[PDB]
């Protein structure tokens, strides 16, 4: 039903269990546009997670500044997205609905996926089915969620705060060191789970990390 | 008459020859605030210069992201600022009026000055009288304006596009190599006068260049 906007806008999309709050942010003005649309997933719904989370919006801004159109959305039960928290299972289906709408509305773009904490778990688990060109995981919650039998794309970036009190950095590293295809990893010193007073540093890490994967020349 | 705003706002200030258009942009949210207020001067009034110039606003954004409050304004004859172009002379007085208002309204802050092209000429010439803590010159128009007998602060940053068609980069370098106290210089390759598709690079150069001069720890 919903139309992909040509001006930054908020809209509602039909999800597997009802309406989903969606926000489409157009790329930064005066920057070479990229034939890419990225979806950014938010952290735990049962806690402080939504499309408005500061880490989520800075990740979105970081990509927009590179000429990428960004889509944010609320998982079921958050904001006015219908339904109830489903521990990452039904949330993968919510993500699929958004991804399929993006691909239908922007058939000539490629798809990038990113997520913070719980959102990183959902996007990583959904990677096999959605086949993104680029995957970005901010504070993947290793040690709490199951990352087995996942199939991320070759171009995968992981950013982790080394002073994260929620996600054990060492748990993340212990997991990454066992993978056959190790993703680019940026360890941010003295950085907390929500990158307090480190959002600008996060922006830099994301931009430098994905720079060479931009399909078009900035 | 005018009050320093506590929310980003546009206001009018009494200048030496009449009203001056002013804009105050508050610092980026979720970033350590700095006890600094910076004024950014625009390029040639007789051509494409105003508080809305893209280079001027990106310079402003670059500083705001570091926790600095930024003030932009239109020189006489531009926008609704009264008066007529005075080739950089009366414009120094316009800048002084803004600087004096800032210092009166924010007595515990220090003052930073920045300018692009013509704006760099005016702020550099006004440095002796205004004694800024930091001076930033973007594309100082060496070769066209007189930079003799100027007294910039010790912390001075110069950013120059190396493919500038308006300002001869070599004229800038030939001038800088004769100074007893050489300012930090960032030469941006294949960059035009208005930093076309290089605004993000400009942001990075400015932020990295002034980082160590921030009075407070980010």
> Where exactly are the structural domains of chain B?
1-218
**Cα–Cα dist A105/A109, whole Å:** 9
Asked if the Cβ–Cβ distance from B200 to A31 is below 8 Å, we say yes
The CATH number, out of the four listed (3.30.1110.20, 2.102.10.10, 3.40.50.970, 3.40.50.1820), of the domain defined by the range B1-218: 3.40.50.1820
Taking CA–CA distances from A55, the nearest residue in chain B reads B30
Q: Do B200 and A54 touch (CB under 8 A)?
A: no
Rounded distance, CA B83 to CA B76, Å? Answer: 5
Å from B157 to nearest chain A CA? 21
Tell me which chain B residues have a C-beta less than 8 angstroms from the C-beta of A54: 30
Chain B residues contacting A via beta carbons under 8 Å? 28, 30-32, 54, 65, 197, 199-200, 218
- CA dist A91 and A15 (Å) reads 10
- Contact (CB<8Å) B197/A32: yes
Cα–Cα separations (whole angstroms), residue B218 to B66, B108, B201:
7, 18, 21
The C-alpha of B32 sits at a distance from chain A's nearest C-alpha, in angstroms, of: 7
Instruction: Give the integer Cα–Cα distance in Å for A38 and A24.
Output: 10
Q: Which of B160, B165, B163 is nearest to B140 (CA)?
A: B160
Pick from B95, B42, B96, B108: which is nearest to B69 by CA?
B108
| CA distance to partner chain B, nearest, from residue A44 (Å) | 21
Determine the residue among B190, B197, B204, B205 to mutate to test chain A binding: the one whose Cβ has the most chain A Cβ atoms within 10 Å.
B197
Q: Which residues of B touch A200 (CB under 8 A)?
A: 28, 31, 65, 218
CA atoms within 13 A on the CB side of B185: 19
Residues 6+ apart with CB under 8 A from B102: B4, B37, B39, B71, B109, B111
Resolution given for this structure, in angstroms: 1.6
Cβ density class B139-158: b for 16+ within 10 Å, e for less: bbbbeebebeeeebbebbbb
Taking only Cα atoms into account, the Rg of chain B, rounded to an integer number of angstroms, comes to 16
Q: What is the distance, to the nearest Å, from the Cα of residue B134 to the centroid of all Cα atoms in its chain?
A: 10
From A217, which residue of chain B is nearest by alpha-carbon distance? B197
Using DSSP, state whether A76 is helix, strand or coil. Answer: coil
| Rounded Cα gap, residues B78 and B38, in angstroms | 20
Q: Secondary structure of chain B in the HEC alphabet?
A: CCCCCCCCEEEEEEECCEEEEEEEECCCCCCCCCCEEEEEECCCCCCCCCCCCHHHHHHHHHHHCCCCEEEEECCCCCCCCCCCCCCCCHHHHHHHHHHHHHHHHCCCCEEEEEEECHHHHHHHHHHHHHCCCEEEEECCCECCECCCCCCCCCCEEEEEECCCCCCCHHHHHHHHCCCCCCCEEEEECCCCCCCCCCHHHHHHHHHHHHHHHCCCCC
Cα(B41)–Cα(B44) distance, rounded to whole angstroms?
10
| Residue B25 backbone class (left: φ over 0; alpha: ψ -120 to 50; beta: rest) | beta
């Amino acid at each position: 039903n919903p139309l992909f906007p040509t001006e930054s806008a908020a809209l509602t999309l039909d999800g597997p269990v009802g309406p989903l709050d969606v926000a489409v942010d157009l790329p930064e003005p005066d920057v070479a546009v990229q034939p890419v649309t990225a979806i950014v997933c938010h952290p735990l719904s049962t806690e402080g997670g939504s499309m408005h989370n500061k880490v989520v919006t800075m990740a979105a801004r970081a990509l927009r500044e590179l000429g990428i159109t960004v889509v944010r959305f609320n998982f079921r039960s958050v904001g006015t997205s219908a339904g109830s928290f489903d521990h990452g299972d039904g949330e993968q289906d919510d993500l699929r609905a958004v991804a399929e709408w993006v691909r239908a509305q922007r058939p000539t773009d490629t798809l990038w996926l990113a997520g913070f904490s719980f959102g990183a778990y959902v996007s990583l688990r959904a990677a096999a089915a959605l086949e993104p060109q680029v995957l970005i995981s901010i504070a993947p919650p290793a040690g709490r969620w199951d990352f087995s039998d996942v199939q991320p794309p070759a171009q995968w970036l992981v950013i982790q705060g080394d002073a994260d009190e929620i996600v054990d950095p060492q748990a993340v590293y212990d997991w990454l060191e066992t993978l056959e295809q190790q993703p680019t990893l940026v360890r941010m010193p003295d950085t907390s789970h929500f990158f307090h007073r480190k959002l600008i540093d996060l922006r830099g890490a994301l931009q430098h990390g994905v720079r060479r994967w931009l399909p078009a020349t900035p």
